[PDB]
């Protein structure tokens, strides 16, 4: 037991925790900035969490454990003057121009500036931003006129991926954040997962914009612009319209997309059902041939980059099915003209993703056929919200509409893709039916769901027991491989997601402030929307999707062979040998 006094209030406690956590647990306001993910910036503490401890002086609450006898003051003039001073020193290195800024509505730094009425000693007003901006990547952008050097991106990359692809760099005697040797992120071991963006409290890290690609296509007379959103968008975008967390906004999105001028409203969940058709067929092929094993999923481009960069010997074990994004895109240039009369060259296919790595996937040289890209543009959840707001579309008051069905219907198995273990569960629902030539009623695989980092299960398919794993976050892939877990038993099918929680926690998603993250389990609440859709959909197996069945019957043929394999599959170039690299 300890006795603590905070702002005159005595507490008796046996907790072993920091001042900051104890105070917040007890409804005592203490500000913080660089603290996130249970880490602060050890080499450059922001000190926004400063408090006074009698007999010690000023201390950082976010990294100081409570101790018996402490008498703490969080709101004295001296404490508040120190905090204001720290914010002022940050304004000295910050281009404070919120009007056109992409974080204007949800910036953590602006909130602190306002709270403490802080002002720079000397305004930072660079007349030209070229030297501060890196837009080389297909997925990420850096604007160092906004960077606080808070280290939250560095810490978050370490925690989420263990790549440490985001680093502190010494650029002629000045500290910046960036990739190894100040290279373009894409040319390093970076996965392009954008977890560093999600951790950034300001507009310093962003997605590489595709909004101009999209607007130019919408305004081109002869382009027919398809749009299709990822599973997770419908569970997330409402947050950016003050609608709260866990709101299913599917119908409003379809309406908003029509109001933005898109010419066809499809859904990547249809592509999710296509990927299952192919992937479950491939798994059954491997089961009936008793190998090869394991098969890894290939639908998360952060994981694909992780394999290319660290485990290229596993590229030969990846499923060859394209991801829902790319498989949908391929079909949008082949099947869709065949049922519409559109000239394939005039089709422009746009996805809305919770993900920055998806932009790199869509821009891979070989992701095209006959000169036509599978996918022409990828906008994040954040970018779609901005497009809606710029168009003055009253999202929260829109009536619901439906997708155009031909490439827009989806089953409950497709619906769950955006949660960790969703691909696994969806794939098993079809694989078991295929292998057993049956229509099984027991389709829920709750043992692969949820936030555990490594989830294993034994499944019975056609009288044989098989082992599956769901790897939940890139750091957990490293743990599974480096610890030898892959060799502890024979795995047959392994799902890997780069973002912990699955795509509902992707790097293109709405930012959430640290206080809301403590109040709301964002990964669970966003995923709950998707599981709810599956629960109430009539068709809960990808192979029961009626639009999909017609597509295969009339155009692609049998999945997993022939035309479907020729067109809808992809093997990574780095799977084969080359030297040098
Ligand atoms: S990052 Fe925040 S404080 Fe800085 S200009 Fe943008 S909104 Fe304003
Ligand atoms: S890019 Fe963002 S998270 Fe990273 S140090 Fe700069 S302000 Fe902090
Ligand atoms: S995109 Fe992912 S791997 Fe690359 S620096 Fe950001 S968090 Fe690290
Ligand atoms: S888990 Fe989803 S959001 Fe994250 S990198 Fe992979 S595809 Fe993108
Ligand atoms: S929030 Fe405590 S040092 Fe930054
Ligand atoms: Cl249609
Ligand atoms: Mg620390
Ligand atoms: Mg220092
Ligand atoms: Mg148009
Ligand atoms: Mg193949």
């Amino acid at each position: 037991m300890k006795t603590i006094i905070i702002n005159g209030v005595q507490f008796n406690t046996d907790e072993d925790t920091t001042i900051l956590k104890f105070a917040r647990d007890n409804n005592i306001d203490i500000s913080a900035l660089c603290f996130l993910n249970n880490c602060n910036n050890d080499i450059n503490k922001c000190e926004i969490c400063t408090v006074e401890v009698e007999g010690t002086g000023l201390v950082t609450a976010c990294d100081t454990l409570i101790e018996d006898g402490m008498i703490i003051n969080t709101n004295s003039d001296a404490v508040n003057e120190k905090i204001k001073s720290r914010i002022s020193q940050l304004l000295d290195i910050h281009e404070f121009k919120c009007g056109p800024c992409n974080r204007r509505e949800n910036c953590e730094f602006l909130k602190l500036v306002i709270k403490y009425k802080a002002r720079a000693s000397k305004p930072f007003l660079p007349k030209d931003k070229t030297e501060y901006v890196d837009e080389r990547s297909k997925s990420l952008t850096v604007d160092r006129t906004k960077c606080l050097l808070c280290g939250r991106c560095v810490n978050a990359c370490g925690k989420n991926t263990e790549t440490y692809a985001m680093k502190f760099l010494n650029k002629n005697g000045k500290t910046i954040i960036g990739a190894e040797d100040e290279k373009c992120f894409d040319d390093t071991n970076c996965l392009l997962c954008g977890q560093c963006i999600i951790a950034c409290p300001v507009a310093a890290l962003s997605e590489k914009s595709h909004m101009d690609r999209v607007k130019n296509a919408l305004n081109a007379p002869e382009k027919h612009v398809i749009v299709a959103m990822a599973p997770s968008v419908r569970a997330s975008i409402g947050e950016l319209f003050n609608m709260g967390f866990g709101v299913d906004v599917t119908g409003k999105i379809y309406t908003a997309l029509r109001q933005l001028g898109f010419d066809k409203i499809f859904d990547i969940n249809f592509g999710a059902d296509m990927t299952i058709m192919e992937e479950a067929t491939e798994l059954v092929q491997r089961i009936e041939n008793n190998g090869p094993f394991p098969m890894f999923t290939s639908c998360c481009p952060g994981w694909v980059r992780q394999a290319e960069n660290y485990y290229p010997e596993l590229l030969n074990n990846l499923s060859s099915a394209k991801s829902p994004q790319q498989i949908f895109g391929t079909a949008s240039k082949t099947y869709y003209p065949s049922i519409s009369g559109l000239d394939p060259k005039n089709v422009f296919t746009v996805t809305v993703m919770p993900c920055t790595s998806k932009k790199f996937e869509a821009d891979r040289p070989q992701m095209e056929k006959d000169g036509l890209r599978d996918i022409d543009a990828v906008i994040t959840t954040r970018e779609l919200a901005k497009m809606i707001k710029d168009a003055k579309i009253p999202f929260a008051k829109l009536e619901d509409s439906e997708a155009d069905p031909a490439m827009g219907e989806y089953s409950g198995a497709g619906a769950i893709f955006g949660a960790t273990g969703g691909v696994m569960e969806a794939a098993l629902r079809s694989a078991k039916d295929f292998a057993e030539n049956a229509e099984l009623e027991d389709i829920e695989y709750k043992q692969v769901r949820g936030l555990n980092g490594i989830k294993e299960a034994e499944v019975e398919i056609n009288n044989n027991k098989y082992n599956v794993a769901v790897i939940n976050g890139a750091s957990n892939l490293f743990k599974f491989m480096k610890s030898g877990m892959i060799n502890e038993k024979q795995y047959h099918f392994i799902e890997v997601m780069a973002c912990h929680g699955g795509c509902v926690n992707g790097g293109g998603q709405p930012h959430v402030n640290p206080k809301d993250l403590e109040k709301v389990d964002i990964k669970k609440v966003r995923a709950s929307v998707l599981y709810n859709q599956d629960e109430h959909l009539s068709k809960r197996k990808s192979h029961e999707n009626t639009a999909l069945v017609k597509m295969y019957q009339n155009y692609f043929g049998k999945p997993g062979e022939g035309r479907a394999h020729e067109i809808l599959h992809f093997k990574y170039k780095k799977s084969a040998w080359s030297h040098p690299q």
Side-chain angles (χ1 to χ4, degrees), residues 264 266 404-406:
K264 209 73 166 175
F266 286 147
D404 299 314

Side-chain angles (χ1 to χ4, degrees), residues 176-395:
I176 62 164
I177 51 80
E180 193 164 284
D181 286 331
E182 212 188 337
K183 290 164 67 182
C184 177
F185 282 88
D186 307 5
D187 301 325
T188 73
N189 285 333
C190 179
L191 311 186
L192 305 170
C193 73
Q195 287 299 319
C196 42
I197 303 163
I198 292 300
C200 187
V202 288
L205 292 170
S206 311
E207 59 266 61
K208 182 61 170 301
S209 174
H210 282 199
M211 280 165 302
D212 279 349
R213 292 188 192 196
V214 176
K215 282 164 168 190
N216 290 341
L218 291 170
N219 289 336
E222 90 286 351
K223 293 297 193 185
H224 178 85
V225 190
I226 294 171
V227 62
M229 63 162 147
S232 304
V233 177
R234 80 209 66 215
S236 313
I237 198 168
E239 299 169 19
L240 294 174
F241 293 89
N242 202 29
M243 283 187 71
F245 296 103
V247 185
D248 189 326
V249 297
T250 308
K252 290 178 168 61
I253 291 162
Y254 292 150
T255 298
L257 292 169
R258 282 190 182 99
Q259 286 189 20
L260 286 163
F262 288 97
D263 302 284
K264 209 73 166 175
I265 311 304
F266 286 147
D267 201 298
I268 294 303
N269 292 2
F270 178 89
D273 286 338
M274 302 179 50
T275 295
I276 294 307
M277 188 84 15
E278 294 304 317
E279 184 118 338
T281 297
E282 184 169 1
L283 179 55
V284 174
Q285 274 164 3
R286 284 183 197 224
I287 302 188
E288 290 180 351
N289 290 331
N290 193 36
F293 298 118
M295 181 158 80
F296 290 86
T297 58
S298 60
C299 52
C300 169
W303 151 236
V304 173
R305 283 186 63 90
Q306 187 173 32
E308 291 178 313
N309 294 344
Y310 293 96
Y311 298 103
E313 71 276 4
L314 297 181
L315 293 172
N316 184 74
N317 294 77
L318 265 47
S319 168
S320 56
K322 276 177 177 190
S323 71
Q325 168 172 285
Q326 301 300 134
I327 215 169
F328 178 98
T330 303
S332 85
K333 304 310 184 82
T334 52
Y335 173 60
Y336 178 59
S338 88
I339 63 162
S340 65
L342 281 148
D343 184 325
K345 83 206 163 83
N346 296 328
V347 180
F348 192 97
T349 301
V350 180
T351 66
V352 188
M353 291 285 144
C355 183
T356 48
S357 203
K358 283 287 169 199
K359 299 172 181 270
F360 185 88
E361 195 181 353
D363 283 350
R364 281 189 182 254
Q366 279 201 94
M367 294 287 177
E368 57 167 61
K369 176 199 188 43
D370 303 321
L372 306 184
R373 307 297 298 161
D374 302 347
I375 291 294
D376 299 285
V378 176
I379 52 172
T380 65
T381 306
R382 295 181 303 253
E383 282 174 284
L384 174 60
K386 176 174 172 43
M387 278 178 35
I388 291 168
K389 286 171 178 194
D390 286 350
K392 288 326 244 193
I393 291 172
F395 183 81

Side-chain angles (χ1 to χ4, degrees), residues 406-470:
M407 282 181 86
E409 174 181 350
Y410 60 92
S411 83
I416 63 177
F417 258 53
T420 166
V423 175
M424 181 56 65
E425 176 159 8
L428 289 172
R429 292 181 185 174
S430 288
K432 202 179 272 191
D433 273 13
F434 292 175
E436 304 188 354
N437 178 55
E439 303 184 40
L440 306 174
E441 260 278 340
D442 266 38
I443 61 170
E444 277 167 14
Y445 292 80
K446 282 173 202 192
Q447 60 277 38
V448 305
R449 306 182 183 182
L451 295 182
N452 288 359
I454 296 164
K455 296 168 278 171
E456 76 103 44
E458 178 184 81
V459 300
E460 186 174 273
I461 301 166
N462 199 32
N463 196 64
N464 279 300
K465 296 303 199 343
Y466 300 97
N467 299 308
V468 306
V470 176

